[PDB]
Short mmCIF file of C-alpha atoms and ligand atoms in Angstrom, two decimals:
data_model
loop_
_atom_site.label_atom_id
_atom_site.label_comp_id
_atom_site.label_asym_id
_atom_site.label_seq_id
_atom_site.Cartn_x
_atom_site.Cartn_y
_atom_site.Cartn_z
CA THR A 1 3.05 -10.03 3.11
CA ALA A 2 0.58 -7.64 4.19
CA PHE A 3 -1.63 -5.35 2.19
CA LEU A 4 -0.77 -1.79 3.10
CA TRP A 5 -3.78 0.46 1.29
CA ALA A 6 -6.51 2.84 2.40
CA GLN A 7 -9.58 2.96 0.48
CA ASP A 8 -13.03 5.66 0.27
CA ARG A 9 -16.16 3.78 1.29
CA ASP A 10 -16.56 2.56 -2.40
CA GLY A 11 -13.10 1.47 -2.70
CA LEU A 12 -11.96 4.38 -4.17
CA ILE A 13 -7.72 4.50 -3.56
CA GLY A 14 -6.45 6.86 -6.59
CA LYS A 15 -6.84 9.89 -9.08
CA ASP A 16 -4.80 11.05 -11.83
CA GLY A 17 -1.82 9.08 -10.59
CA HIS A 18 -1.97 10.66 -7.00
CA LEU A 19 -3.95 10.01 -3.96
CA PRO A 20 -7.46 11.78 -4.50
CA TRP A 21 -7.72 13.31 -0.41
CA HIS A 22 -4.64 14.38 1.85
CA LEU A 23 -4.78 13.14 5.02
CA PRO A 24 -1.69 13.22 7.03
CA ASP A 25 -2.65 11.25 9.92
CA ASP A 26 -2.76 8.05 7.60
CA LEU A 27 0.47 8.89 6.05
CA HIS A 28 2.00 9.06 9.71
CA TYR A 29 0.92 4.99 9.85
CA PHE A 30 2.67 5.44 5.85
CA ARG A 31 5.80 5.63 7.45
CA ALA A 32 6.29 3.72 10.59
CA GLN A 33 3.97 0.17 9.57
CA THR A 34 7.05 0.66 6.75
CA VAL A 35 9.53 1.76 9.06
CA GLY A 36 11.90 -1.13 8.77
CA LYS A 37 10.29 -3.46 6.52
CA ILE A 38 11.09 -4.80 2.17
CA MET A 39 8.14 -2.24 1.13
CA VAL A 40 7.39 -3.04 -2.74
CA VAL A 41 5.38 -0.37 -5.31
CA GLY A 42 4.60 -0.22 -8.43
CA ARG A 43 6.63 1.99 -10.54
CA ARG A 44 4.08 4.70 -10.59
CA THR A 45 3.15 4.74 -7.24
CA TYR A 46 7.05 5.17 -6.54
CA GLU A 47 7.00 8.13 -8.99
CA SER A 48 4.44 9.58 -6.82
CA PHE A 49 5.76 10.27 -3.79
CA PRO A 50 7.09 13.66 -3.37
CA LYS A 51 10.70 12.44 -1.74
CA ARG A 52 12.34 9.59 -3.75
CA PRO A 53 12.91 7.35 -2.10
CA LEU A 54 11.47 7.48 1.10
CA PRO A 55 13.85 6.50 3.73
CA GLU A 56 14.58 4.03 6.42
CA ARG A 57 12.22 1.39 4.59
CA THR A 58 13.71 -1.21 1.22
CA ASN A 59 11.55 0.39 -1.36
CA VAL A 60 10.88 -2.33 -3.71
CA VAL A 61 10.07 -0.88 -7.06
CA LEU A 62 8.32 -3.54 -9.70
CA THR A 63 8.17 -1.76 -13.48
CA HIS A 64 9.02 -3.73 -17.44
CA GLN A 65 11.39 -1.23 -18.32
CA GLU A 66 15.44 -2.91 -18.26
CA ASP A 67 16.74 0.72 -17.70
CA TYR A 68 14.70 2.38 -15.13
CA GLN A 69 16.44 4.00 -12.78
CA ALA A 70 15.88 4.45 -8.97
CA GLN A 71 18.94 5.37 -7.15
CA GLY A 72 18.61 4.06 -3.63
CA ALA A 73 15.61 1.53 -4.41
CA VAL A 74 15.50 -2.30 -5.56
CA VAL A 75 14.50 -1.72 -9.09
CA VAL A 76 13.32 -5.78 -10.27
CA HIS A 77 11.11 -6.94 -13.34
CA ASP A 78 8.58 -9.50 -12.22
CA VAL A 79 7.43 -10.76 -9.15
CA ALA A 80 9.47 -14.21 -8.82
CA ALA A 81 12.69 -11.32 -8.13
CA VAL A 82 10.57 -10.09 -5.40
CA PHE A 83 10.48 -13.01 -3.46
CA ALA A 84 13.73 -13.84 -4.49
CA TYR A 85 14.65 -10.48 -2.50
CA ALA A 86 12.33 -11.08 0.28
CA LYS A 87 13.97 -15.14 0.01
CA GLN A 88 17.52 -13.36 1.00
CA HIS A 89 15.76 -10.74 3.51
CA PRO A 90 14.35 -13.20 6.19
CA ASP A 91 14.48 -10.61 9.41
CA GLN A 92 12.16 -8.15 7.16
CA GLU A 93 8.59 -8.25 6.25
CA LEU A 94 7.00 -8.07 2.99
CA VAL A 95 4.61 -5.41 2.99
CA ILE A 96 2.23 -4.43 -0.88
CA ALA A 97 2.02 -1.04 -0.73
CA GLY A 98 0.29 -0.62 -4.35
CA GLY A 99 -1.07 0.37 -6.31
CA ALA A 100 -3.83 -1.53 -8.22
CA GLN A 101 -1.51 -3.08 -11.06
CA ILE A 102 1.08 -4.36 -8.32
CA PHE A 103 -1.99 -5.46 -5.81
CA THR A 104 -2.76 -7.81 -8.91
CA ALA A 105 0.41 -9.69 -9.12
CA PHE A 106 0.52 -10.76 -6.03
CA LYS A 107 -3.26 -10.96 -5.24
CA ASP A 108 -2.18 -14.97 -3.91
CA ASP A 109 0.19 -14.28 -1.53
CA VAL A 110 -0.95 -11.94 0.27
CA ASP A 111 -2.28 -13.01 4.42
CA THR A 112 -2.56 -9.81 6.06
CA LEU A 113 -4.39 -6.42 4.61
CA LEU A 114 -3.79 -3.16 6.26
CA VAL A 115 -6.77 -1.52 5.16
CA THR A 116 -7.69 2.38 6.07
CA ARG A 117 -11.19 3.46 5.11
CA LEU A 118 -12.57 6.93 4.43
CA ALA A 119 -16.21 7.06 5.64
CA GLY A 120 -16.18 9.74 2.37
CA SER A 121 -16.56 9.31 -1.08
CA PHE A 122 -14.43 11.24 -3.27
CA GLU A 123 -13.77 11.23 -7.61
CA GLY A 124 -11.38 9.27 -9.51
CA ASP A 125 -10.15 6.70 -11.71
CA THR A 126 -8.52 3.71 -10.04
CA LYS A 127 -10.31 1.21 -7.10
CA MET A 128 -8.78 -1.53 -5.01
CA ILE A 129 -8.95 -5.14 -6.57
CA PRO A 130 -12.18 -7.46 -5.21
CA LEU A 131 -10.88 -10.19 -2.89
CA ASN A 132 -12.11 -12.90 -1.03
CA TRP A 133 -13.28 -10.37 2.41
CA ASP A 134 -14.63 -13.70 3.85
CA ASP A 135 -11.38 -15.68 3.61
CA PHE A 136 -9.81 -13.38 6.06
CA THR A 137 -10.90 -11.87 10.37
CA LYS A 138 -11.28 -8.30 11.79
CA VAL A 139 -8.63 -8.58 14.47
CA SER A 140 -8.16 -5.10 14.88
CA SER A 141 -10.41 -1.83 14.20
CA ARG A 142 -9.52 1.74 15.52
CA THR A 143 -11.04 4.96 14.34
CA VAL A 144 -10.28 8.20 13.80
CA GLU A 145 -12.13 11.15 13.68
CA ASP A 146 -11.51 14.07 11.56
CA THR A 147 -13.55 17.73 10.97
CA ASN A 148 -14.37 17.34 7.24
CA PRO A 149 -16.03 14.39 8.03
CA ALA A 150 -15.36 12.70 4.43
CA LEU A 151 -11.36 11.96 6.45
CA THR A 152 -12.85 10.16 9.50
CA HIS A 153 -11.30 6.49 8.92
CA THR A 154 -10.76 3.55 10.88
CA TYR A 155 -7.76 1.17 10.59
CA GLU A 156 -8.30 -2.13 10.40
CA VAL A 157 -6.16 -5.40 10.88
CA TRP A 158 -7.30 -8.52 8.97
CA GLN A 159 -5.85 -12.00 8.91
CA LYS A 160 -6.55 -14.29 6.67
CA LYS A 161 -8.40 -17.65 8.18
CA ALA A 162 -6.68 -21.91 8.31
C1 BDM B 201 1.93 8.99 -3.58
O1 BDM B 201 0.60 9.64 -2.53
C2 BDM B 201 1.46 8.74 -1.49
C3 BDM B 201 0.56 7.92 -1.28
C4 BDM B 201 0.74 6.98 -0.40
C5 BDM B 201 0.38 5.61 -0.11
C6 BDM B 201 -1.13 5.20 0.88
C7 BDM B 201 -1.21 6.36 1.99
N1 BDM B 201 -1.65 6.71 3.42
C8 BDM B 201 -1.89 4.94 3.22
N2 BDM B 201 -2.44 4.41 4.62
N3 BDM B 201 -1.55 3.56 2.33
C9 BDM B 201 -1.76 4.05 1.48
N4 BDM B 201 -1.84 3.10 0.71
C10 BDM B 201 1.72 7.52 0.54
C11 BDM B 201 2.96 8.77 0.26
O2 BDM B 201 3.44 9.06 1.34
C12 BDM B 201 3.71 8.71 2.49
C13 BDM B 201 4.73 9.64 2.99
C14 BDM B 201 4.89 9.80 4.33
C15 BDM B 201 6.48 9.46 5.23
C16 BDM B 201 6.27 10.17 5.96
C17 BDM B 201 5.35 11.44 6.32
C18 BDM B 201 4.77 12.03 7.56
O3 BDM B 201 5.16 11.40 8.77
O4 BDM B 201 4.33 13.25 7.41
C19 BDM B 201 7.61 8.40 4.85
O5 BDM B 201 8.58 8.96 4.90
O6 BDM B 201 7.36 7.67 5.07
C20 BDM B 201 2.31 9.72 -0.78
BR1 BDM B 201 2.79 10.62 -0.77
#
């Protein structure tokens, strides 16, 4: 199980229910780091995607609303249902794409971090949950420079030590 995110230099991930930046490169790598997988997102991050569902991947939406409707998405109500779905699934990798409340609900079962680090600093109200960095190794790092230098970003892959 991977966590799929993008943060500024201080850890910020969101502002007013939406992204605090607009960084097309990093949403091209959202679509294909989850083309094909089981993608888990919290109800509010699902409602803030422009197309609902975004296509070619299993969108699982985590909501406490018993009645919620999301045509074409897998609507569950606790973490045990996520993993009961993933157990049925097998051959699809599970990627937790946010936001903060859902990262906290899977904080013990993530093995890989897929983090995009912005060089700048943005204003908002939601930060990435604290994690033990010391328990992971950075395996891969690729940097992309943008003409807004706040937007220059690094894609890191981190994997959990034995
Ligand atoms: C709520 O705002 C968003 C937050 C994200 C969250 C996010 C972004 N980027 C990264 N790397 N990590 C994240 N956690 C994705 C997103 O739409 C992804 C949509 C991409 C399209 C393809 C787009 C394209 O390639 O131009 C898709 O179907 O996947 C939106 Br809109």
